[PDB]
Amino acid sequence: TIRQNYNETSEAGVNKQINLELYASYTYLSMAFYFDNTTVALPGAHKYFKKASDEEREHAMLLMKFQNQRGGTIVLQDIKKPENDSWGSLKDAVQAALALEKHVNQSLLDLHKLADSKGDAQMCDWIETHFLTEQVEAIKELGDHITQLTRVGHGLGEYTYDKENLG
Amino acid sequence: TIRQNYNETSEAGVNKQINLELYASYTYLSMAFYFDNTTVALPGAHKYFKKASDEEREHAMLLMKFQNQRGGTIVLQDIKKPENDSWGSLKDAVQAALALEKHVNQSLLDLHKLADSKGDAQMCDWIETHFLTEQVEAIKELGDHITQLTRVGHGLGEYTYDKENLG
Amino acid sequence: TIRQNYNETSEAGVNKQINLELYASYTYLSMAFYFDNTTVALPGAHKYFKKASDEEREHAMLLMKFQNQRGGTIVLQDIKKPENDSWGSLKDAVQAALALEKHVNQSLLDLHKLADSKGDAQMCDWIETHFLTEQVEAIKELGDHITQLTRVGHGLGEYTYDKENLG
Amino acid sequence: TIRQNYNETSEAGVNKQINLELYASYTYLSMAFYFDNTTVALPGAHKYFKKASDEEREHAMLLMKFQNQRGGTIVLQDIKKPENDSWGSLKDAVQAALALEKHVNQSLLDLHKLADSKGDAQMCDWIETHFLTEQVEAIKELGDHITQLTRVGHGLGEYTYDKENLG
Amino acid sequence: TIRQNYNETSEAGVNKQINLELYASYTYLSMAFYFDNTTVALPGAHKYFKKASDEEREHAMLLMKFQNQRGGTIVLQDIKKPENDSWGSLKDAVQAALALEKHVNQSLLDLHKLADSKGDAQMCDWIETHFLTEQVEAIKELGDHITQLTRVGHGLGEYTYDKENLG
Amino acid sequence: TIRQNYNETSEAGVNKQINLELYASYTYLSMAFYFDNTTVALPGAHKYFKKASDEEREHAMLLMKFQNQRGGTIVLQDIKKPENDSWGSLKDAVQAALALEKHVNQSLLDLHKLADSKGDAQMCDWIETHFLTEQVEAIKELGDHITQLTRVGHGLGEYTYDKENLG
Amino acid sequence: TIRQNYNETSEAGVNKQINLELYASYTYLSMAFYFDNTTVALPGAHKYFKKASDEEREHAMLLMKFQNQRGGTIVLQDIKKPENDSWGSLKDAVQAALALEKHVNQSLLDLHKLADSKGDAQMCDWIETHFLTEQVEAIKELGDHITQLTRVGHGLGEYTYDKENLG
């Protein structure tokens, strides 16, 4: 009785975006506690990736909120474990996060294209409002970090950027 | 001299959306004073529908504001009286309002589709920004009310939800 | 079971004074946004007639609350559109509103005479408290406005009085 | 070089209590948004189970911080989806959570017994400080909730207890 | 490594929008100091066009910010001098600014159409969010000024609107 | 359905602990009001033992809250009148309290050894957290008062230590 | 007469622990003022190790207070001069500190075991509360310091970590 102009493949897409967000929350959680391991001991990346872990959880809840708003049905799936147990250098992890956000960005743009093909005017604006530009700004930020992590180099530079920039 | 990329059927659509909003303001006004009748005596729905009556008036003024912004001409028509003189149970009225907002939602989505076909980029975003998601959230809210009004049932439950939720 | 000394004919007059108030509100809303149109562009008039639209909408709602309080039943009719689509000069519009308020005063006086004949002291005093003096002042204000608008003439004076007096 | 009196089997129990906590968090997130669905529409339950989702997610992270502090290595597994897609009545859901917390208490007690057998006083006291009493209270709270939900019955009472007690 | 779904003709369009904004900043700067010439001595238009000069500079920087966000390359060109060295009456200059903003509005709508044809979902929303409605409201405002500058007429009227409205 | 890892013996032992703190509370009240008697008239000792009476009462209430929290059943017994109807000198009653608290301490340690023997890890930590260390601080306090009340002697010593240290 | 459940060997062990905690403060005091030597001139390390020395002297007084509370007897031995008059680099001193903390941790765990095997439930919990988890926190912290000291390297890095992290 509330569902209106809400295509069933869109509802499917929304249910798949939820898992991808939760999967990205779990990767940043792994990364965050990787930098908390004594042998890595980078507390600034810890802080930086715990916050990314929190925010990607919020994104998943926004989609579940969205799924209920439009009259859809939320269906959850296993949250896959992250592709690695350790994440290398600070620069390595940022690199791995850039690739994660680009992949999430394509799913969001495909989800938008799908919704657009089915005439879902509110769903498109909704994805634009809550996701399309945050993704762009998240990706620009990781790129910047990577350039800067290259410039400062390993060793003291890595300590510094971790402390004075991340967190 | 200001009109730019503003199709004349769009201007017509905007003029018809104005009347539909004013017609919905008038229905919620009828509903609001129906609950003020001693034989109904639901002061919380009174408050809830007076506020919906005010907000649907504001929507109509936003469109008139919009009509003048884009270079169009506002043409007003008779505001039809509401389809009923009394509105039944609290649950009945919410049900009648859900159906009103769904109908308004389709007109807004058709108005958007029309504007889109004529390339009106600003008009589309404008409808999305001011209407498409407020409609979605208004519809989700009425649905929720209806589920809750079913759960509490008639009698004391109806008194309670009126007092402790509506207004 | 609350109706007392409330005559059926008085109930009908209230019902029709309600529709009359909604109609003056619609007329002022029309004038308000006529002055928002770029080809007119008198911002003060726009604010002046928009708040007059809000006020005669509140008159209608008082009459509606009164109808209920005394134990009548509200019956709404269509609100006919305004007279005109455009309202000419600032002075033409104030003169048009004067005529409107003037007609509105007469049916209030008619409603008062009707109630007196039915021995309805409370309805008579209610009408004097909320309407009869507040119309006398509105009519005096408009007469003042017309004179002043006549004094300052067209062009620079119309802008001046619109900016410095209305709103 | 910081590991001390930390047994490999205890490290494995922590790793699996981590995954267990993430799993209870996912289950509660599932219940939280089941109550946000319009066909259910219990706002209090939604806030109650969303904050319980946040909490058992923090349990997982404590265990993660502990694993690192004592010199183990974190190993994450997939978080299996919840049991069910819908959770029935408010009382069904609290009973389901009771069973869940109940299972979670047992493996904490198992983890405690395991650690005791390895002579691991610090890990035992850590588990008592952060988990063992905080589970006893959670289980008592849920038992209380079930009784109360049993007392107020279906319909108006479920709404009442959802509004006035959960959240 | 950050560029994603960012068409190279879009990047070209963005680089051309930058120059058009800077060109409009420079015209309003000329206009602003024209009204500062003793022989014109309109200090309110001075203030009004210095602020428009500042804001059109900001628009150009938003696009450069945009160009770097999406992974593009900023390429600057000569900022052409304004089409006139003097700008006539206050009404003449506003008229010249209306025509400037309408031209800028078409470039923005063409830039949007281009981006839309290449599927750039984020770029479209971005142009809508930062430009499409500010343009509409800037154009409605200049039109209004022009109507009012006609009404007040030359001489004292021109002094007044300059002082009491512009700035 | 909330009971877990809570042995039937422990529960019996909690019930008699309940009775033994209530017995202590009442012994301490009798002491307190003995020192309020005009023939004794030590206002410090009255305050001191009325306070300890309240604390042992709170202990008994903590123990009843724990019985409920772990899923047992409170079973109350008669509260036996205290050992004496009068308590001699100030040092005498402090000495009776030391004996009493050592009896309560040894009961708590047996209740702990019982609970340990059944693997009730939460019970053990609860007794450590609220009882075992408070008993040892109390006993040190009592031993300290006796040494001092020995050092100050009878007469003006007793009076002084009553007024300046106890209460 | 206050000694209850306090074994002869538990007491000898607190006395040995008092001396051990006194030995740590002396070593850390020695570390502290080495980093104050002109040929060393690390002010962070001095601040940081002066604090370590204070803390370990707090720990010694806690045990001295415990021995008195349980009715044992404090017996003091000489406080041996530290192993080294000089401590090398910052990372060398921190590594020495991690070794002493693991040693001190072991005899605490040893002391905890001795008391367990005598059934001293209070003494065990007392060591958990004031010592075992503090030791794990200190050992983890020291670890992190060695990893970061390796990462920042010699020279500027050693200076940087000393200023920006230690004190």
Residue numbers in the entry:
A (entry chain C), B (entry chain C), C (entry chain D), D (entry chain D), E (entry chain C), F (entry chain H), ...: 3 to 169
Could you share sentences copied from the article?
Ferritin is the main iron storage protein in most living organisms, playing a key role in iron homeostasis and detoxification. Thereafter, we introduced a self-assembling strategy by designing π–π stacking interactions at the shared protein interfaces involved in two different kinds of 3D protein nanocage superlattices, which is referred to as key protein interface redesign (KPIR).
To elucidate the detailed structure of the 3D protein arrays, the high-quality cubic crystals of P156HAfFer were obtained, and subsequently, its crystal structure was solved at a resolution of 2.50 Å. The space group is I23, with unit-cell parameters of a = b = c = 229.16 Å and α = β = γ, indicating that the SC lattice was yielded by P156HAfFer. Additionally, two pairs of electrostatic attractions were formed by Lys93 and Asp94’ between adjacent ferritin molecules.
